Amino acid sequence: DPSSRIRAITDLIHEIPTAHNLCHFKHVTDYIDGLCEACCIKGLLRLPVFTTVGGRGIGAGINNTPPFYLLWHANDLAGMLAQNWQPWDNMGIPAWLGSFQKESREVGLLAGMTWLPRKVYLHDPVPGQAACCSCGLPSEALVYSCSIEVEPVPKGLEWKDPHGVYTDQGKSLQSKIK
């Protein structure tokens, strides 16, 4: 839904800096540099698995702190899907079918892999000629703002990530590289 809060389109991209902090290694400014019609979907698909804790609005997502993600490789895309093809007993419920779908404590694969930790609404394209700040290809239309407001997951949810790694009690094993 269209929440009244307005945020720049660069908040969904981690490598591109946003409000506060610094802007070195990526010389951009808010609301003047936008995203094309593919990088917006790139940012949208990154929501359920790489959502950071943040400041106020500590609730990150179904995995809290993002852990290591391990999966088996191949040499072709159709081949790549075969190694990691592990159907479960129940295929949960759709979470991208236009339904927010308040479920029970136990969740499923289709409702887990497509989580939406934040309400998101993208504004209409703006005419122009400039390129985006992620892939850099010149285009005709760009998106410059979005409506983002934080949402907390229900406490005590039961969900084991198929590609996650846990230490001893379900706590996420992150990367301790500084």
Binding site: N75, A131, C135, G136, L137, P138
Partner: protein, 97 residues
């Protein structure tokens, strides 16, 4: 293969990295080919594209011949110790006398 000093250690193997080559016989990429993101398109909004990369090896002595360094590396003061037996000094001494 240039060298720099006398006891310069050398490798027997020289790994080399080469771009993949088409030709429609092996039109598909081989199994031992890695993928590198170093095909430039633009620079100011920098844009790079994937490129298939193959690896091979070389051995010194059969494909590349080891060369030798030129000039002098280690510097020492001249410090010529005087000699009283060669002909030039024996004539210079008599000329002074």
């Amino acid at each position: 293969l240039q060298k720099r000093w006398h006891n310069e250690p050398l490798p027997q193997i020289l790994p080399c990295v080469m771009d993949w080559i088409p030709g429609y016989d092996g039109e598909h990429a081989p199994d031992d080919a890695e993928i590198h993101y170093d095909l430039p398109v633009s620079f100011q909004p920098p844009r790079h594209l994937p490129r298939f990369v193959i690896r091979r090896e070389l051995v010194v002595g059969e494909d590349v011949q080891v060369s030798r360094e030129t000039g002098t590396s280690v510097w020492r003061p001249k410090g010529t110790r005087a000699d009283y037996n060669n002909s030039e000094y024996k004539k210079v001494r008599a000329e002074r006398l």
